[PDB]
Amino acid sequence: MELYLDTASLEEIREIAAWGVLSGVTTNPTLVAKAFAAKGEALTEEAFAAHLRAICETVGGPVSAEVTALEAEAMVAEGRRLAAIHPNIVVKLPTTEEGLKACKRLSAEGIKVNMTLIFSANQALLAARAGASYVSPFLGRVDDISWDGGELLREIVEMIQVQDLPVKVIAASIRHPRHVTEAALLGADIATMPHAVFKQLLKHPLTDIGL
Amino acid sequence: MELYLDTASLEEIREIAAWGVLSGVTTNPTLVAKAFAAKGEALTEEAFAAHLRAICETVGGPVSAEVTALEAEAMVAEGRRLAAIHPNIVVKLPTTEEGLKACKRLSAEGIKVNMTLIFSANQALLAARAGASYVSPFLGRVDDISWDGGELLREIVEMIQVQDLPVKVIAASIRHPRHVTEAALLGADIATMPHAVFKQLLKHPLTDIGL
Amino acid sequence: MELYLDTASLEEIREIAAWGVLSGVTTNPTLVAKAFAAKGEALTEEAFAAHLRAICETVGGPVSAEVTALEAEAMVAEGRRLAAIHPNIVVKLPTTEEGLKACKRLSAEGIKVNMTLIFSANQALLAARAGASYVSPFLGRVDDISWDGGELLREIVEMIQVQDLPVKVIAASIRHPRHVTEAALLGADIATMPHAVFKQLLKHPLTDIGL
Amino acid sequence: MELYLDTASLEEIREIAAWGVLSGVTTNPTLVAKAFAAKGEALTEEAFAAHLRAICETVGGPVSAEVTALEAEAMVAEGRRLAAIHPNIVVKLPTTEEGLKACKRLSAEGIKVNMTLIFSANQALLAARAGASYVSPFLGRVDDISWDGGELLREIVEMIQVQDLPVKVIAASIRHPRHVTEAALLGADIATMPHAVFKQLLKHPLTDIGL
Amino acid sequence: MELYLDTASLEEIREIAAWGVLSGVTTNPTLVAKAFAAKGEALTEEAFAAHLRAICETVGGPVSAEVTALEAEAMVAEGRRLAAIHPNIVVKLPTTEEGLKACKRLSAEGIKVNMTLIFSANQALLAARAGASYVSPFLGRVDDISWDGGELLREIVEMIQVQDLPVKVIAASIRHPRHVTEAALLGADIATMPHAVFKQLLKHPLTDIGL
Amino acid sequence: MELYLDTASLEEIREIAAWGVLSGVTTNPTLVAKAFAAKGEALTEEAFAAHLRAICETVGGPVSAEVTALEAEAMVAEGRRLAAIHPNIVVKLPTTEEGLKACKRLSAEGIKVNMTLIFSANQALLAARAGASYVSPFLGRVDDISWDGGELLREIVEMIQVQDLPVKVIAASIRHPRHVTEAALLGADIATMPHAVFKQLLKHPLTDIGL
Amino acid sequence: MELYLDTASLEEIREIAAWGVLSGVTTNPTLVAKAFAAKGEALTEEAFAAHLRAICETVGGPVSAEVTALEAEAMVAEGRRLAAIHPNIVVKLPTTEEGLKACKRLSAEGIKVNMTLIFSANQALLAARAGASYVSPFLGRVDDISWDGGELLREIVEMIQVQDLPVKVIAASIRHPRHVTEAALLGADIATMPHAVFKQLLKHPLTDIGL
Amino acid sequence: MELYLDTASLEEIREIAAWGVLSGVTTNPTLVAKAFAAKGEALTEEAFAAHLRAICETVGGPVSAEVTALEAEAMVAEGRRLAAIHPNIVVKLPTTEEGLKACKRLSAEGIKVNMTLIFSANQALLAARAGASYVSPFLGRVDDISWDGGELLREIVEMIQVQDLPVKVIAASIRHPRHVTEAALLGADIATMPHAVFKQLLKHPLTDIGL
Amino acid sequence: MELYLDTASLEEIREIAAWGVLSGVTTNPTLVAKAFAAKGEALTEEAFAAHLRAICETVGGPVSAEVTALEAEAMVAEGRRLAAIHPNIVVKLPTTEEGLKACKRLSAEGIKVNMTLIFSANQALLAARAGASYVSPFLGRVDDISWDGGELLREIVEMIQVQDLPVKVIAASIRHPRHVTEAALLGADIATMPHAVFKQLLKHPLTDIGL
């Protein structure tokens, strides 16, 4: 399973990159905001593009950028602008009716689409059907409402496997180390997680005592 | 799993086709009549074929048209007529002794047949043996008589899988979203459902909240 | 498993009562409103209590009546009123922070409480812990968002048994005959459904031909 | 598991009765008609009663007698007449809406009711709810339409066990030796079968050579 | 699980009884004959009786004696005489129509019956229903025809547990040590075997090496 | 399963106590200091004792207080002082050799002991054998080490159930709602969690949309 | 599961008895030889019994004394002597024919017997049938020859639970911490181990880190 | 499953090699010192090199050589040196942040890395994603802290299988024969064990008497 | 599963081979000793070889000949001569340290080796690692000591499958028919048995009555 960092922090990214285990990165408006806020710069379109481009160069792998439009037409326009930032950019769209429409168009144009905000295997199926390259179910948010996020992932992976669909599954909304193991054991293609969880992955008491 | 619409309404077909997830359509006289009633047009034999042709062009995928005859020879004649309307048309026959004889003759002539009204694995096996391209078990109508429709589908899918049969399975009589997920998890090739269910598939409170 | 009717229609209740299988009734403002709609009469506070009293007399078993207040104090006052209408009255409260507070107080006063709008096992556990006499998970509504409603029921029933909790489970939001069978097989104490589902439970082709 | 004979033939009843393993008998208008025909005796109202009495005295256990009316009030009238024939008589009713009405009324007066023509766990549940003493699902006829009769029995037995219901289960429509075993293994209370099957039960190769 | 000896040899019985693990003895004519043949003794009623009584006195547990008649009335007379020789005697009958008839009478008179030559669960069930105190399925002989003797045992045991039948199960036709273990784990009440097998039970390399 | 709060904040304790679902509280030095920091009060022995009594009075159930010594003698002395603070006080000891010694001594004097910092079933067994009234496995800290904490709880509960030990199990180090559900399903007696998790337990989108 | 020490060292016994987890002790000739050897004390029937009695007073529970005779008659005499040393003494005998004979007589006299050197379910069964109060399979010696010792324990416990035998199971030959856990989980009544394994049970990195 | 020797003893290597079952050897600084000591020489740079080279040539398989540095750069410099000694040498790195960086560099340079001190599947996945050729979970050390070492082997193997990762699994910390069996059954590619363990693999009582 | 005969009797080999189901033969000193005894001839190096050569020509498949040496050098020399007798000959060595050393050299020369006297999966593994083409576990001897032989075969087969080892499994020590069925269902490649068992394989009472 490939591991992705769910952040916009170039420092966090560069650190995990050095480990040699970073396959990609996923961002969203709030994560990009925290980045600039925590830095000595204002968030302008010019700066936004340069930051995404810099992340793409650092990671050397796919980087997801979220559209904020609510209507399909505007979503497509925005997706194209994001994809025009760097060849490694994957466009992230919410799995809704409009998102579905946008996914069909963008993917028919050769632009890779990551369908996010998925909370059911049926949503994942429609997205795959609409041309999604990636589907991102949210494990943590499911646990938040007292349901088993892991079972959501399982149904999606199992459905994609028996149906032989090409879409790749991204275990998202990772809250702890076992979310990663579970996704790996289930057959997820990718797991994206915050820097803190990534930093926890490598820790174990028996390891230290062995050093 | 490919998604089909069980309707004759071009408006509905257009809405879902725009999502980019529509792989086909299945109809019946009832459905074509209704569509024609919702409109101010008389349902004449000609306007009929014209309608089926409009659906084929709109979905750009397989479209099932039901024969009304009960005798093998009449079914075959009607079947040839239907197939001539457009090359995307699939002939739907009832799974009866006559349906079997007709299915045998039609499939031999290179005409794809959808065997419907299937309520047991044995009927699915006979239909498959007769050359059917598709078999359509009815999940909902089974639940209707207090039996588990999902188990019906399970036996049909497993048998076909165990027996290495070419025939494709269409889960029909879809009543709710879990019927779709189940069919997909089991390995059904297609699920055909009414517009209302298709519109329910995308709904989840957490997606709305995430927007 | 005891079977209940979810309605306010004395006519529907009389019919099922005649069968000799009606153990109780669940109502909500909308159902009561519709009841007075079909017939000719204004829905006043005095006729409302008169109607619930009548229902209690026709079924001769527990009748659930919904609180309207959103804050605890008002919920307790309204619950006492409903419980004073007739000894067969069970007070239904939403499973929220306020409903939990109101549940503790009404149950301490010997009033039977039905905690409704339950969509997770954790909500049912809190309700039971709060003194609920009944807990009502919604199967169909969960199915509506592409999750397995029966699996919510399962988790709730299994926790209750393993924990030896006194609370009884009411399978609500029944949509089809199999929801009933699954609730019975799982161990739900009660299943409450609309008159249309109740009327479908006896139907089967073999019985008809058998007669 | 108690074993019953589904017949009206005193000769057959007598033979099995002597093995000391016959607990009861179930009959219907047909089987009684064949009995009289074979005995070249006219089926009068006086002979009918005497024959049932004769069967009751011979087996010395419960004897099921079928009502013919379709309407509830008539089913009850005939039900009382039947029960008055002999105290061993158990009244059999079709599991329908009228059957349910008649079941509640006759069971309330102390008369034991056998609800038959059951093809779903839901029908069994309503019957148990209406006061049935016995519930009779038909295994063979379910097999006749390519569904597993043993699964119907399984679901019914499990539901009754889990719901801790008083009603007893009579595995009916027995066609071969394995139906009996399965019923015994699943937990059925009674298995009523035809003489021909009862005779097959104790036959086995190794037994004869052992002799 | 109580252990029995399949023999009529007083020296064999005496050696094992010394171990303190002998609960009973099962005999048959061929066995009794070889014991009398070992000496120059004639096999006559008084000697036969004296010998069985000696067995009883020695084992201090139930002792099974086989009837030879093939007609019930004769089986009954023989059973009564066998029972009269000593209170620990259990009458063994073949599981057949006549055997069932005899079982009913003998057991109704307070005589313990051991139905043998059992090869199916249905035979065991008929025997149990006829009044048998014990049923003796033959594991070894079933394995002789390439079937699983243990499965015969399992089904009988399960049926007995599930059905709450009084009868006890004697794992008979025990050929080897694992048969004993197999029968112990499957829940058989008793296991009767030849002296040769009893002497094989406690053998094990590690025990000897541990001495 | 009984719900406990893992905090020393009275404001948090009072809010959940009012829901009527709080069965107890567990504390530790760090949690106490935070509570005092938040109220801006000096943490003296007297204020500490008054604070603990305040908690005991608000919850009206068991309250765990931690000993800070690691020698058995000092642990016992400290445990006696904590127990003397209020009759609802349960003494928490670390599961170590010294902890086992103190546990023996304290439990022998009627003081209830909660053995904590348990990460293996063997530690839980010793603690139980030493006289612990409660054992507290840490679920979250195991997950942090990339091992399955829910599995640790499973092994502990199963062992406890299988061995029929009276010790009660407190699922601790709760990080999310599913830890609570899982612990309840496994059969744990108690779950102790932070206020944020307790508050998340009631949350579910379908409940809000239902209001 | 009760924990025992396999040693004759009164110092080791005292250390563990001080944790309040020591339920008994198991000894053998070679073990007591070491104790005296280490103390430079001379072996004498007077000192021997004085030492075993010292053990008894210390532990305060059952103490196993190995019998060295190989002949039943001698085993019994030697057994009566050991039993006379202290009322807590449990006589250990080899599971052989002679052992079984000695076990029968000794147990009949009211003396608790521990049948050791058990390596198969059949041996365990014989021992229990002979009046043994305990059976001691050896897990480690089985693992020593590439067979799963745990599986031997599994079969012994299953059989005992299945056959409702009174005998208690003592998992012997414990080599590591998981032996204890596995034995506890399988349902062994007691686990006896050397002091070194006892001192390992509590070890765990997270416990240390937590302090 | 390939079998390795965890030693630096040419004698041991030669013995097991003669068996023809030795596929490789794992070494560490310690094992090297003990070999030189027993030999009589003090390890120098060239002495160390000629020894590892001798091992390679003797085994004719891959040999693991442990790095000593703690910082990435140093681990790389030292790793390049070990690799230069011979082409059979596999560099062994500790699975830590630094080890990962080292592994990434070294493995890119064609050198094979063995990541050791792995105690979680998440650690194994990171090692694998860093380019590791082998991952070595320590079964024994896990069993030491009372957890199941096999479970950790099982998760690493399942994950590597499901994720189709190149990496091979080396089961380390092998203590007894059954660790070998378990590793093999669990699908480990290699098991490295000390000479003393190989020496017990072939032992069995029945084999002894077989000769 | 290929069937083999365990004998030297050319007569027996000739009969079974007539059935068309013999794929090979297994011999040993004893067996050939009785073949030459019943026949008129003495056992000489010339007679031996010639005889085995005849068996080869008769069976048309592999023939296993056991060496009698006890040292690697003696086994190799003796192994070379046996393979020289005929190309079908398979050299059977005992699974010991010497046998392994032998196996390595022989197999390395191109001689097919059959390792025997295997009573543990570890032995089968070492053997397979040494070059064995066949491994032979003895089910019967294992059952003899009250352990389950099938379980050993199962583990050996599971290990070989998972590890994808070339070696073939010959199920030896077959005492009866079910051993053959059990070895087949488990997945053994070959089953070697005595003439007597073969003659019992197709026995069935239903086949007889079917004739």
Curated annotation (Swiss-Prot), chains A, B, C, D, E, F, G, H, I:
UniProt keyword annotation of Cytoplasm present: yes
One GO term of the biological process aspect: carbohydrate metabolic process
Main location per the UniProt record: cytoplasm
Active site, renumbered: K92 (schiff-base intermediate with substrate)
One Pfam assignment: TAL_FSA
The protein's annotated pathway: Carbohydrate degradation; pentose phosphate pathway; D-glyceraldehyde 3-phosphate and beta-D-fructose 6-phosphate from D-ribose 5-phosphate and D-xylulose 5-phosphate (non-oxidative stage): step 2/3
Superkingdom in the source lineage: Bacteria
Gene Ontology CC annotation, any one: cytoplasm
Compartments, as annotated in UniProt: Cytoplasm
Reactions catalysed according to its record: D-sedoheptulose 7-phosphate + D-glyceraldehyde 3-phosphate = D-erythrose 4-phosphate + beta-D-fructose 6-phosphate
Gene Ontology MF terms in the entry: aldehyde-lyase activity; transaldolase activity
Alphabetical list of SUPFAM superfamilies matching this protein: Aldolase (SSF51569)
EC assignment: 2.2.1.2
Keyword set, alphabetical order: Cytoplasm, Pentose shunt, Schiff base, Transferase
Enzyme category, top tier: transferase
CDD domains the record matches: Transaldolase_FSA
Role description: Transaldolase is important for the balance of metabolites in the pentose-phosphate pathway.
Alphabetical list of PANTHER family matching this protein: FRUCTOSE-6-PHOSPHATE ALDOLASE 1-RELATED, TRANSALDOLASE
Protein family membership: Belongs to the transaldolase family. Type 3B subfamily.
Name listed for the protein in its UniProt record: Probable transaldolase
Organism encoding this protein: Thermus thermophilus (strain ATCC 27634 / DSM 579 / HB8)
Native organism taxonomy: Bacteria, Thermotogati, Deinococcota, Deinococci, Thermales
Encoding gene per record: tal
